[PDB]
Design an enzyme around this catalytic site. Structure first.
Site, short mmCIF file in Angstrom:
data_model
loop_
_atom_site.label_atom_id
_atom_site.label_comp_id
_atom_site.label_asym_id
_atom_site.label_seq_id
_atom_site.Cartn_x
_atom_site.Cartn_y
_atom_site.Cartn_z
N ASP A 170 0.85 -1.18 0.00
CA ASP A 170 0.00 0.00 0.00
C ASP A 170 0.89 1.23 0.00
O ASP A 170 1.09 1.85 1.05
CB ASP A 170 -0.89 0.00 1.25
N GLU A 204 -7.16 5.15 -8.15
CA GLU A 204 -8.48 5.50 -7.71
C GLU A 204 -9.05 6.71 -8.44
O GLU A 204 -8.38 7.71 -8.62
CB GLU A 204 -8.46 5.74 -6.22
N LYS A 250 -9.94 1.87 -8.91
CA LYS A 250 -10.50 1.85 -7.56
C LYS A 250 -11.63 2.87 -7.39
O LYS A 250 -11.47 4.05 -7.73
CB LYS A 250 -9.40 2.06 -6.53
N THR A 281 -13.44 -0.07 -3.00
CA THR A 281 -12.73 0.30 -1.81
C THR A 281 -13.65 1.02 -0.83
O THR A 281 -14.85 1.17 -1.10
CB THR A 281 -11.56 1.16 -2.17
N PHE A 312 -11.58 -1.81 4.71
CA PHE A 312 -10.67 -0.95 5.45
C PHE A 312 -10.67 -1.34 6.92
O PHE A 312 -11.51 -0.88 7.73
CB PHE A 312 -11.08 0.51 5.21
#
Lengths: 326, 326
Positions: A21, A102, A138, A162, A184
């Site tokens: 990440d 994203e 994303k 996400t 998350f």
């Protein structure tokens, strides 16, 4: 034959596809993950890197040299996207797998605008010479974002859904044929610590872990194909408590920690058999009620959207300056 | 399609074979389990039942009428066994499945004596007109008891390996072709509460649950055929945290509680795919070290053996009186 070592990073790599990440090659080079993920915050962060400054220009260049003739907003938003893609492009050189980029989070409640932007981002990647399959677009897991993912996935653009905080998002995502979901975990934790009066949790009781586990089980036991990828962890405890999972995306800090730990790593998630019939379709009205009914998921989606949109504008402020210096 | 209700007892019955941990028909009739289990304590307990007093005689009768000509110990020990079998016989009339009857625990460190007693108990059941397959002979999970189970299982006498507190016992049991294991969940709890300084646990962190889970995963992921049957619970929390398991044996008290609870029951254990190669055989020396190395399992086996042997003698004292009243 109980577990089979070297260290926890290496160990995890064998039961789970490990993903970094971060936007920064330096971390990718050091940990050699198979996928990577970015997001508006990580892009903002990476954009502050010295070695990456060249990429901001090459973005303004492209934006300009393509756009001979200036729309102070429209043109900013084209440099924005390009920068993300440039940064993705850079990490891609050093990973065998896939990248997650994203869409502008301000698009979160607008399906059509979202799909437009996804195709855009894909095209930008094709221009850089990259097969769309190396890419995961994303999208925040709102109803609208999932409807978007439906459309895109149906034409072979693959999505990472996400800001996932709940079973209902999970079911909906899967029912719409989504490639991957990124729940998350750390944030579910944060919410409970700040709202429950329990304020210490252990790996087992960690409500993020509990949530992602229910989902994982639901997916496999029901045959749904969507990849489950835990994300956004507060600690190694949670990552460990998920060892076995399809993939896991992990900060370089937590990544370092895992590599440094030499204790054995017990597998916790396993390949489970498909034995239950695909369930009744989850309707919009049911989704929206479920979601309104769960304080933490209701809070945490909205907030992650707010935060990511915010980072889009602060990213833009900084790009605006570089813009006017011509 | 998330879970699919009525109440928790009924719910559990659908993902897990439910077994009553009692000797008393009254409880069996009320809860309609598929198997049942007894043990020296439960037999001692059941023997105090008024409606069962007839069974003590019919045991002394058989002991005597068979044994026209008295060995004050030898003959006591024959009435002992018969009583257990009589009680098993009674529960069997009211259950579709299997019964678990435990050998005299004083035999725990003696393989040959153990197998002798198992065959004995089987024969006694054949005499009562019962197919051996309706029967599980329960043996404490010492090395010797497992070696016994090896021999017996190889000739088609099926075993419940009980007082199981550890992975090493689990592996060994399975490597020796054992039919079923009964890990003592509540007792693992008891040990930790009384020895660790943590003294509150929740379903997830409950060390019994954690243990039985590791084992379950190890069994399925490695193809081993031994049934996993959690037993001897302190609370519904643990039973719930195991929902999905092959079987679970449960006290009538906890059984009542489950039936009374109407909340939905999430499945926690799932059918997992066989994907790992059968591991290196666990040697005696390795078993014994593992086992000495784990304070709680080392303590809890010994103690359960002590307790069960003790209950054998107090059972015998009481039978001795009925003996001398002729």
């Amino acid at each position: 034959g109980m577990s089979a070592a070297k260290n926890k990073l290496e160990a995890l790599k064998a039961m789970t596809t490990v993903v970094a990440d971060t936007g920064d090659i330096e971390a990718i080079k050091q940990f050699k993950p198979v996928d990577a993920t970015t997001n508006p915050s990580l892009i903002l962060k990476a954009a502050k890197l010295a070695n990456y400054q060249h990429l901001i220009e090459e973005a303004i260049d492209w934006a300009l040299q393509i756009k001979g003739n200036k729309n102070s907003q429209t043109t900013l938003e084209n440099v924005g996207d390009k920068l993300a893609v440039n940064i993705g492009c850079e990490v891609l050189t050093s990973i065998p797998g896939v990248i997650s980029t994203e869409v502008d989070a301000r698009l979160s409640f607008d399906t059509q605008a979202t799909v437009a932007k996804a195709r855009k981002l894909i095209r930008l990647y094709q221009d850089a010479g990259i097969d769309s399959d190396r890419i995961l677009i994303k999208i925040a897991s709102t109803w609208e974002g999932i409807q978007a993912a439906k459309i895109l996935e149906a034409e072979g653009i693959h999505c990472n859904l996400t800001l996932l905080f709940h079973f209902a998002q999970a079911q909906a995502c899967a029912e719409a044929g989504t490639t991957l979901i990124s729940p998350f975990v750390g944030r579910i934790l944060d919410w409970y610590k700040a709202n429950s009066g329990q304020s210490e949790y252990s790996a087992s009781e960690d409500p993020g872990v509990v949530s992602v586990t229910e989902i994982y089980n639901f997916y496999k036991s029901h045959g749904f194909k969507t990849i489950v990828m835990g994300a956004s962890f507060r600690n190694t405890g949670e990552i460990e408590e998920l060892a076995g999972c399809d993939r896991l995306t992990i900060s370089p800090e937590l990544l370092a920690q895992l590599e440094a730990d030499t204790s054995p790593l017990e597998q916790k998630l396993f390949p489970i058999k498909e034995t239950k019939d695909t369930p009744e379709l989850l309707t919009e009205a049911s989704f929206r009620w479920a979601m309104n009914n769960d304080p933490m998921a209701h809070d945490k989606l909205a907030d992650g959207i707010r935060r990511f949109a915010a980072d889009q504008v602060t990213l833009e402020s900084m790009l605006s300056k570089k813009i006017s210096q011509r």
